[PDB]
């Protein structure tokens, strides 16, 4: 889904975050509340 890319965006040569991870907002609400 979000862990992969196509061969039109991955082959483009010219073309404090820490929370734009893959399973972040699902694991955040698991080991915290519905914040």
């Amino acid at each position: 889904g979000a862990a992969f890319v196509s061969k039109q965006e991955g082959s483009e040569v010219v073309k404090d975050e820490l929370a734009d991870h893959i399973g972040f907002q699902e694991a955040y609400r698991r080991f915290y509340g519905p914040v």
């Binding site: 979000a2 890319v5 082959s11 010219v14 404090d16 509340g33 519905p34 914040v35």
Partner: protein, 664 residues
């Protein structure tokens, strides 16, 4: 004697081992050691929520997170988030007691052990101050720094105002000399001497007096590069002697007042400022207490002469505690002179720059720019060659420079993938880096499976491409081609090795792209038209937009070429934006990108004329939210350990409370 008042000792003091322990355990005043003990322990209290990441552990070490971690030892796995707040609580109560001097031997080990736990748990958080704060916490654990201005003085009578040995200063002076002087040897590179590393730094407003006398190109060569080489080579030499300390304390306090505002290095410019008076005479905080008013001196520490202590050798043969102190001086300061040059031993950590970043004092000597990162997995069951995201499960971007972190990333991706229906991936990294304005080239070989590739810490990496140092005189021409282009045309300089090729996908956005061959011989393949074209030196070839092309390097020498491209849809946006920019003043997704840019330009304008009393009032509320969230989210999980975990609807009630901006 001429030497004895100059070096502090005579040559006869180095004539034996009993005379050397007597010299290095000389009774020395405790006062300069104890002000640095306060200033280091107070700057570590302010560093634990800010840079150590106590404000952001819930985003970093969250439970149930698929993440590729980079520890130095592969067996170092972090604790749960409920217990990693206790590691940062013990490290806080370690730095709190090391600040006050309350149970100072326990409070040093309660800081030293969970600092080097979280330091070695992530190789991408290593830099030259995070290394140094663990060195200074390692030194001060053995130093009798609570012998003045402490709570141990108020509890123990033999720790109140007592002498410290001379090796407590000669290791701390020997450390700050090595931080200064070895950095001046690492800045003898051809990139720092000729002025390529930190070339954009002179355009800052702090170098404006130097531009009143020199040009912008001569401010960069002399003041930033050679005035940072002649200062680093001669900082610990000037602070040491008596004839040049008052001159030398000015040049190194100006050096760190600038680096506090130029770079975001945390407390590095304040730790190197609090450690420069260690080179002063050790009675300097007694000379400032006596210069204070009389009713102020009752709150200050003692001004009386220090009592005799056990840790010193008085004019008496030395015991064991004195012999272990002079041995710690000669073995540690020789070990500190060896690790920045120990890169011939750890040759697996050797890349384009020698060794792993953090312990060599090569600060700002190499700067990078990554043009293209492409991760290609390969499903072992089907053969379906797919393409991963550039930075998938990492929390940093330092793995693309180092071969050890690429093996940790390729190994971690080999286990994580099976959750995403890729059973056994074969992972190829195609990473294009240019170091110090050089040509962009592949640092790692893009044909080898990095999962099964052989990285060993003591043998040289076979899949790291050699940095083409024979194309380093080309960089004077690369600034000529970059200057020859207008505001619309951008260029990308690329050197590719013999036998390799670059598969590139020009977007539909980039109309009128061209490739020109600077050196060598490349054959550019159009994939859709299935037609090759051999380029000569200087020959330009127009490339199709919205299609594929491959540039096969067929020369025996590493070939140099460049991508002269222009974003035509960026033009067609801005020539149509400038059409109604003038049409508006004479009196539908296009109007949405228009209106968000004008309120952006009034935001950049309003940020420039805000008063200085509001930038500092917003700086504290930015900072006091970091200290409030790091404290309140600690007690959220410290309740989870003592009183157990509550219900999840209650855990929401505290985390939304802890995430509140206090006065915003």
């Amino acid at each position: 004697s001429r030497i004895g008042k100059l070096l502090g000792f005579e040559w006869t003091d180095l004539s034996s081992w009993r005379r050397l322990v007597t010299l290095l355990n000389r009774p020395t005043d405790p006062a300069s050691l104890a002000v640095f003990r306060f200033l280091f322990g107070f700057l570590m209290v302010l560093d634990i929520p800010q840079e150590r990441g106590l404000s952001s552990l819930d985003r970093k070490y969250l439970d149930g997170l698929d993440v590729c971690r980079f520890p130095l030892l592969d067996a170092l796995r972090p604790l749960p988030l409920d217990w990693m707040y206790l590691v940062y609580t013990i490290m806080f109560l370690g730095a709190l007691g090391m600040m006050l001097g309350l149970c100072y031997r326990i409070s040093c080990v309660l800081f030293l052990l969970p600092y080097w736990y979280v330091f070695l748990l992530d190789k991408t958080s290593w830099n030259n101050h995070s290394y140094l704060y663990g060195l200074l916490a390692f030194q001060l654990t053995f130093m009798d720094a609570n012998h003045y201005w402490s709570v141990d003085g108020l509890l123990n009578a033999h720790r109140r105002n007592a002498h410290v040995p001379l090796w407590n200063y000669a290791v701390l002076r020997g450390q700050i000399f090595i931080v200064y002087f070895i950095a001046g040897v690492k800045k003898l590179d051809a990139d720092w001497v000729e002025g390529y590393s930190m070339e954009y730094l002179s355009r800052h407003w702090l170098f404006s007096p130097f531009k009143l006398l020199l040009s912008e190109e001569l401010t960069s060569l002399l003041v930033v590069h050679w005035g940072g080489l002649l200062l680093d080579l001669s900082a610990g030499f000037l602070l040491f002697f008596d004839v040049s300390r008052s001159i030398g304390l000015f040049f190194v306090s100006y050096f760190h007042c600038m680096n506090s505002q130029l770079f975001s290095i945390g407390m590095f410019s304040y730790v190197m400022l609090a450690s420069s008076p260690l080179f002063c005479s050790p009675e300097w905080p007694r000379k400032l207490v006596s210069y204070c008013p009389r009713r102020l001196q009752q709150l200050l520490p003692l001004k009386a002469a220090p009592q005799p202590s056990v840790s010193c050798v008085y004019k008496q043969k030395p015991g064991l505690r004195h012999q272990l102190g002079a041995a710690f001086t000669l073995l540690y300061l020789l070990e500190q002179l060896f690790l920045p040059y120990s890169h011939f031993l750890t040759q697996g950590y050797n890349n384009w720059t020698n060794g792993l970043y953090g312990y060599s004092w090569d600060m700002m000597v190499h700067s990078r720019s990554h043009q293209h990162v492409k991760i290609t997995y390969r499903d072992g069951r089907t053969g379906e060659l797919g393409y991963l995201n550039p930075g998938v499960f990492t929390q940093s971007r330092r793995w693309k420079d180092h071969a050890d972190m690429l093996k940790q990333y390729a190994t971690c991706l080999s286990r994580l993938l099976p959750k995403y229906n890729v059973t056994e991936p074969q992972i190829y990294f195609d990473i294009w880096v240019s170091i110090n304005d050089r040509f962009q080239q592949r640092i790692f070989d893009p044909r080898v499976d990095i999962v099964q590739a052989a990285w060993s810490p003591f043998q040289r990496t076979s899949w790291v491409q050699p940095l083409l140092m024979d194309l380093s005189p080309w960089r004077a021409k690369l600034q000529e081609i970059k200057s020859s282009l207008d505001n619309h045309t951008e260029v990308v300089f690329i050197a590719d090795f013999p036998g390799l090729h670059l598969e590139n996908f020009v977007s539909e956005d980039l109309g009128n792209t061209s490739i020109q061959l600077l050196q060598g011989e490349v054959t550019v393949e159009l994939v859709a038209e299935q037609k090759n074209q051999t380029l000569r030196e200087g020959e330009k070839m127009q490339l199709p937009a919205g299609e594929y092309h491959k540039v096969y390097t067929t020369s025996p020498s590493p070939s140099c070429y460049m991508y002269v491209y222009v974003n035509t849809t960026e033009l067609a946006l801005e020539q149509d934006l400038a059409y109604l920019q003038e049409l508006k003043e004479k009196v539908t997704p296009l109007v949405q990108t228009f209106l968000r840019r004008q309120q952006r330009l009034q935001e950049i304008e309003r940020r420039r004329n805000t008063p200085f009393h509001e930038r500092f009032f917003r700086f504290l509320l930015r900072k006091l939210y970091v200290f409030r969230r790091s404290f309140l989210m600690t007690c959220i999980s410290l309740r989870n350990l003592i009183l157990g975990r509550p219900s999840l609807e209650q855990l929401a009630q505290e985390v939304t409370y802890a995430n509140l901006r206090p006065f915003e």
